[PDB]
């Protein structure tokens, strides 16, 4: 309860833990702490009736996000872990149950068969792209195939539990907790170039309510890096 | 290195307005102020107003109601403009920089844009 | 310094990092990292940065002129010379490509 | 304000030969003076500046000399490119006035 | 002998800084002085070798009296009496004679009858800043520095007079006590032209003699 | 010899430290060190025959100096100390004499009688202003009463070696090497509305050489922040 770091503070109480490590340390590399190890809470989503789902890139989610941004920038390679917060706030009144995956190389495929998709579809710098419930038409220029039951990377969407996960449960629970190391090949990598995870929210049972209640629950992503070590003189 | 220079009208109508814009080059001026000198062949040289580096001008008193000398530290440019244009103004106008190793001396001129009042 | 002895003067010798412009004028190249160099108290300035397979500047910059003497020529010379510092760790030998 | 009497109003000499330029002020300027030259058509260029300094590129033929409200410039040694025009300004407070003009004819 | 130029037996000394004059009966008599160090030339000399100084205060006040013409038929007025009330600050200020900001609280104020010894008061060292401060380059305005403030002093009489007037002069004496200087300075050239500020007209260095040898 | 400070080298072979003190450390103040102390080199001015003197303004003249200009605008108060290295090279074939005083809280006077000096005729960012050897004319707007044999503070130019300070004779020596604490009557001052230092370089015996040597001989002034420390959370 009424955890802190740096200048921010956030209020808590289950954490699942990454493939069973926790984010760690190792020309040489600088380690700066102060200016990045803090609470990066991106801008609250909807969750309405006839909703479908949402997805962030991750090292691109805090790409304009304070220091960490300047960061991003102003070196050329780095490594970074992650430590993911979410929590929506519904009644007793409400019910549905929410998915929360954070999915390591998450390859997505374009709605036209012979290109891949653009820059802008993929990955929205602090801002949810979403998913569809039906199809996206193919002739058009360059989208992204975001039917949900295939979650976009041409996989059966009720297999996603393989990736570290947490469910959910409007009825029993209320708040979701990642931690997430660095997971790539190379020791150390590009940080524009490369979006090594992809935090995903899928709505299986839909939201309902009865007449009266507020018709939409908002959801709030809370993201701390943790361990970020970058190569610069 | 290379300095100052301007661009003017040309000629004007008599009772008529006057601007010309000297731009610089290669210093700032938040170091420097530049003088108006007018050559003119009746009368001789005789310096016109001046702005110094801080904002402030400080014009002639016999051209003190007729000009108006303001500049941007940003574009690097300085305006001024003289009114209502008698027969006398027939003469060439220079700007030149201030302030020779903090003397108040002028360094380099411009090229000068001579003016003709006559219809 | 290949010049006189009589000769002094200063210059920059700044270094961009890879990712980093390189630098278009001599106050920001001093705020990068960058060697002071004297020629009038030492002939030779030595300089370590690693190489990798943008990838770096080391542009060098006027810091003053060069006040000379009477009776002594004042366009000098420089030379520049490179070497290995550490252990490079080469892999993977292919054949060269200055043949025909 | 001040007026600045430059005499004489005109000289014709030949290359070689030591002239003086004087310009008396109405008052005290305590050495504010600066000396121009001005060729045929051309804009002005600054000569001698606070009554005894050199300019940057000027050459050490020319000389100024003076305190006070007495003030002279002179050139030991003509030359063909120091004929023109000569004027004297104070810069001791506004309004700056500049003097009347001599002239070199070199003959 | 080298201990009467220590900063104790150099500073300890009193000086008349203010006189002033003020009547009872022409409903604006009352005096006002501003507490400071550039009040009198050669104190201010003195005090200017120095950058930051740091000292209580001991104030005393010579005060007499002298009979305007009056009108007529056989004046007699029995022992004045005054008030010198000391503004901190941060305080009230008084602007006529029958005002509020005499009968307040927290000015300490001395009352003095004629024929005695002349009040003595003693101010300490009042200030946010951990010594006073003789320069300052920067601004608050350019260098007047709103740290070292020492307040205001006030005078007047507390006797109403019906059949003759009484006007009265004051002159305040200034005493430095436990006095410590720090970062000395160069002492002063030029004469002094203005109270706030350090302006001066530029003068020779030396006085001329006629050759070298 | 070529002493490193951050990411910076300078190159020397005497050096007088302030009052006697070494400059040293005391809400609660932050300690930032490695991106301030480094050796801020100001461009070179030009030592000709007809020179006069100039003047920068301490904590002025880095206000736009890499990250300690970050760190003057985004933090209120602050204190610091100095270290200043002067040196200017010239051949066996020069002469002349310069003094290298650093005043403390050195009150200019205004020509103008009435008024006091405009902000932008007391102090250049990083650009030095300059001394005459006349008297500046009364009735102008607002200038600096500038005369040199003054020093612009009413006080006569001998009196300035009470002042730390060292000589640089060119028959004998070539450099000169400050070290200034902080010297304030407040533990911790405003660094926009204060200049608690003044660097002066004053030419008394002026530059001589023959015909055919080089007219000018540059000085170079290298500060580098010591023991800096400032107020915020």
Same mark, same amino acid.
């Given at each position: ?18 493939? /069973? ?30 909703? #479908? ?27 970074? /872990? ?13 019910? /549905? ?30 801002? #949810? ?11 058009? #220029? ?33 708040? #979701? ?57 | ?20 814009? *000297? ?10 102020? %530049? ?59 220079? *700007? ?18 001579? %003016?003709?009042?006559?219809? | ?17 890879? $990712?980093? $412009? ?79 | 304000?001040?007026?600045?009497? +430059? ?29 121009? +030259? +001005? ?5 002005? +260029? ?62 | ?136 380059? !920067? ?22 007079? !019906?059949? !003759? ?49």
């Amino acid at each position: 309860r009424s955890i802190t770091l740096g200048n921010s503070t956030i209020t808590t109480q289950n954490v699942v833990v990454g493939y /069973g490590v926790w984010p760690e340390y190792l020309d040489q590399p600088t380690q700066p702490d102060v200016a990045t190890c803090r609470f990066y809470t991106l801008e609250s989503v909807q969750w309405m009736k006839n909703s #479908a789902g949402w997805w962030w890139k991750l090292p691109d989610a805090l790409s304009q996000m304070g220091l960490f941004g300047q960061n991003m920038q102003y070196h050329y390679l780095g490594r970074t /872990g992650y430590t993911i917060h979410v929590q929506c706030n519904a009644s007793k009144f409400h019910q /549905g149950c929410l998915l929360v995956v954070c999915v390591p190389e998450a390859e997505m495929g374009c709605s036209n068969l012979n290109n891949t998709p653009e820059f802008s579809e993929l990955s929205g710098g602090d801002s #949810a792209r979403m998913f569809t419930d039906t199809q996206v038409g193919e002739s058009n #220029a360059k989208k992204v195939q975001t039917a949900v039951w295939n979650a976009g990377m041409g996989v059966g969407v009720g297999n996603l539990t393989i990736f570290p996960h947490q469910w959910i449960n409007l009825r029993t629970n209320n708040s #979701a907790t990642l931690v997430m190391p660095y997971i790539n090949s190379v020791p150390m990598d590009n940080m524009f170039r490369h979006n090594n995870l992809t935090l995903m929210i899928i709505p299986f049972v839909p939201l309902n309510y009865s007449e009266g209640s507020s018709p939409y629950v908002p959801i709030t992503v809370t993201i701390a890096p943790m361990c970020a070590e970058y190569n610069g003189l | 290195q290379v300095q100052l220079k301007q661009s003017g009208p040309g000629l004007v109508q008599p009772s008529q307005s006057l601007s010309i814009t *000297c731009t610089v080059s290669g210093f700032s001026l938040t170091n420097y102020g %530049v003088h108006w000198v007018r050559q003119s062949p009746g009368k001789g040289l005789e310096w016109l107003g001046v702005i110094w580096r801080g904002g402030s001008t400080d014009y002639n008193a016999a051209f003190m109601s007729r000009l108006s000398i303001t500049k941007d530290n940003s574009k690097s440019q300085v305006f001024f403009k003289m009114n209502s244009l008698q027969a006398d103004d027939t003469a060439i106008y220079y *700007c030149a920089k201030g302030d020779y190793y903090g003397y108040d001396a002028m360094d380099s001129w411009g090229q000068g844009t001579s %003016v003709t009042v006559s219809r | 310094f290949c010049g006189s002895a009589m000769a002094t003067g200063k210059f920059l010798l700044a270094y961009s990092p890879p $990712g980093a $412009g390189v630098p278009k004028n001599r106050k920001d190249a001093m705020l990068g990292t960058h060697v002071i160099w004297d020629v009038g108290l030492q002939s030779s300035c030595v300089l370590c940065v690693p190489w990798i397979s943008a990838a770096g500047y080391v542009t060098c910059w006027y810091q003053t002129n060069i006040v000379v003497p009477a009776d002594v020529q004042s366009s000098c010379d420089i030379l520049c010379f490179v070497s290995a510092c550490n252990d490079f760790s080469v892999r993977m030998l292919k054949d060269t490509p200055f043949i025909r | 304000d001040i007026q600045m009497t +430059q005499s004489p109003a005109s000289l014709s000499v030949s290359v070689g030969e030591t002239v003086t330029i004087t310009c008396r002020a109405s008052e005290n300027v305590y050495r504010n003076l600066a000396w121009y +030259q +001005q060729k045929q058509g051309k804009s002005p +260029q600054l000569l001698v500046y606070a009554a005894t300094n050199l300019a940057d590129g000027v050459p050490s033929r020319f000389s100024g000399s003076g305190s006070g409200t007495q003030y002279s410039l002179k050139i030991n040694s003509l030359q063909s490119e120091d004929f023109g025009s000569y004027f004297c300004q104070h810069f001791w407070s506004p309004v700056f006035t500049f003097g009347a003009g001599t002239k070199l004819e070199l003959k | 002998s080298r201990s009467e130029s220590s900063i104790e037996n150099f500073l300890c000394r009193s000086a008349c800084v203010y006189y002033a004059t003020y009547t009872n009966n022409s409903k604006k008599g009352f005096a006002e002085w501003v507490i400071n160090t550039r009040q009198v030339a050669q104190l201010r000399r003195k005090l200017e070798l120095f950058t930051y100084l740091r000292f209580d205060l001991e104030l005393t006040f010579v005060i007499t009296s002298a009979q305007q013409p009056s009108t007529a038929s056989s004046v007699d007025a029995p022992v004045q009496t005054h008030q010198i009330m000391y503004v901190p600050p941060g305080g009230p200020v008084p602007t006529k004679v029958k005002d509020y900001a005499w009968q307040t609280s927290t000015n300490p104020s001395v009352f003095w009858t004629e024929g005695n010894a002349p009040p003595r008061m003693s101010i300490p060292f009042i200030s946010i800043g951990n010594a006073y401060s003789c320069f300052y380059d !920067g601004w608050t305005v350019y260098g007047i520095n709103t740290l070292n403030n020492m307040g205001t002093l006030y005078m007047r009489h507390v006797n109403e007079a !019906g059949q !003759g007037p009484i006007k009265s002069t004051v002159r305040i004496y200034f005493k430095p006590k436990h006095v410590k200087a720090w970062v000395p300075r160069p002492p002063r050239l030029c004469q002094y032209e203005k109270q706030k500020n350090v302006n001066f007209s530029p003068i020779g260095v030396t006085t001329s003699r006629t050759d070298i040898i």
